């Protein structure tokens, strides 16, 4: 398992993971910022939403605005940190999985 979940937000809008599609995490990644979440905190964020060490989340942009933007669903193995959908592309945003427990969000 990786030490941290590392998120590279390369957009001008805040990103966040909505656990099981509905529950905002406490660890949003601010604009033009990299953020690293200790792995135990991740495990807990996913507590109650984990089956077979797998946990899904919906990724949103403009998470600190009135109108957030649904980018698409992802699932992660909490023991390998492997993120199954290698890319997303929706609402003129793109997500790319870089390796276990790290990914970047770009605009377009």
Numbering used by the authors: 1 to 108
Task: Show passages lifted from the paper.
L. pneumophila also expresses a type II secretion system (T2SS). The Legionella T2SS exports at least 25 proteins. In summary, using a combined cellular, structural, biophysical and biochemical approach we have provided a characterization of three novel type II secreted substrates, NttA, NttC and NttE, that are required for infection of several species of amoeba. We also report the X-ray crystal structures of NttE and NttC, the solution nuclear magnetic resonance (NMR) structure of NttA and dynamic analyses for each substrate using complementary biophysical techniques.
NttC is a 130-amino acid protein encoded by the lpw18401 ORF in 130b strain (lpg1809 in strain Philadelphia-1; lpp1772 in strain Paris; lpl1773 in strain Lens). We readily obtained crystals of NttC at pH 8.0 and determined its structure using selenium multi-wavelength anomalous dispersion (Se-MAD) and refined electron density maps to 3.1 Å. The final model of NttC contains two identical molecules in the asymmetric unit (RMSD over Cα atoms of 0.080 Å) and all residues could be built except for the N-terminal His6 tags. NttC has an immunoglobulin-like fold composed of one α-helix and ten β-strands, and residues Cys46 and Cys55 form a disulfide bond between the α1-helix and β5-strand. However, NttC is unusual in that it lacks a compact core and instead contains a buried internal cavity. This is formed primarily by the sidechains of hydrophobic residues and is inaccessible to the solvent. Analysis of the structure using fpocket revealed that the cavity inside the protein has a volume of 782 Å3 and a druggability score of 0.97, which strongly suggests that this pocket may be able to bind one or more organic molecules. Furthermore, when we analyzed all known sequences of NttC homologs and mapped the sequence conservation onto the NttC structure, we observed only minor patches on the NttC surface while many of the residues that form the internal cavity were highly conserved. In our crystal structure, we could not detect any access to the cavity but using MD we were able to observe a breathable core and a transient ∼12 Å diameter solvent accessible channel form over the course of the simulations. Due to the restricted access to this pocket we expect that a large cofactor is inserted during the folding of NttC, prior to its secretion from the periplasm.
